[PDB]
Amino acid sequence: LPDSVDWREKGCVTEVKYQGSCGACWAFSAVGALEAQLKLKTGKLVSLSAQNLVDCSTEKYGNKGCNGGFMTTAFQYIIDNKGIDSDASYPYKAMDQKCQYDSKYRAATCSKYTELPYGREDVLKEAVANKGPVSVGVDARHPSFFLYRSGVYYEPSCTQNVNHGVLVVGYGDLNGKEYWLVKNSWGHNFGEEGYIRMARNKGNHCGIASFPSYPEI
Numbered sequence: 001l002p003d004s005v006d007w008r009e010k011g012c013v014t015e016v017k018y019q020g021s022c023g024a025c026w027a028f029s030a031v032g033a034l035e036a037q038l039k040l041k042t043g044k045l046v047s048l049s050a051q052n053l054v055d056c057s058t059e060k061y062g063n064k065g066c067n068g069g070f071m072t073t074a075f076q077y078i079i080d081n082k083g084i085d086s087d088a089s090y091p092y093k094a095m096d097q098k099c100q101y102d103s104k105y106r107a108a109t110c111s112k113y114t115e116l117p118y119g120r121e122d123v124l125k126e127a128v129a130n131k132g133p134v135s136v137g138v139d140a141r142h143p144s145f146f147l148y149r150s151g152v153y154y155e156p157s158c159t160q161n162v163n164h165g166v167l168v169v170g171y172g173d174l175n176g177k178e179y180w181l182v183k184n185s186w187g188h189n190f191g192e193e194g195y196i197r198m199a200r201n202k203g204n205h206c207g208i209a210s211f212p213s214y215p216e217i
């Protein structure tokens, strides 16, 4: 595998989004993963509607809108629904709304998704290299997370109990520290223009490889 990957370089990552006071990280993680696949398949980079997932991938999928959800079940909704609308057509409001999905605004489909084996950072590396960005959960509870600015994030108090959905868009090494390149959804003010480099091959640090998944068109 390549020693480093950055899907931003391949034009497969949309602008960082801002979830506000709505726990829609899972929806941003899911659409991020699918956006990459849509670029790979069609050559067009298009932001997909996190709001569509918040409003429409609801109780049947075990999701709770602004109070949390699962990336995998979001993928299944997109499969079941035979599409997801673009962000432009179905914009993000940081609140729970009625389902307003319309196929005339469909910007992507999903045929399947894959869940990677628990805690296997080597398998995650392979997927990020060979498949695309991968949806993951991380333990983002610790005060240091919110205050991250640079370098490679390592928090001794981190656990594998994940609480925040994010997107792995790459990996590498910076000054001798291996990292996962993670796109967050707290706007470009967070971290490095909305990204955080998180420790890689350090014992499934912060649970980053606990629950990875990626969709396919």
Ligand SMILES: OCCOc1ccccc1-c1ccc(F)c(F)c1F
Residues within 6 Å of the ligand: 019, 022, 023, 024, 025, 026, 027, 029, 066, 067, 068, 069, 070, 071, 136, 137, 138, 162, 163, 164, 165, 166
């Ligand atoms: O904005 C993200 C907050 O997410 C919440 C909120 C409430 C209950 C659960 C979760 C939650 C936990 C883990 C994870 F990987 C998720 F993607 C995820 F949504």
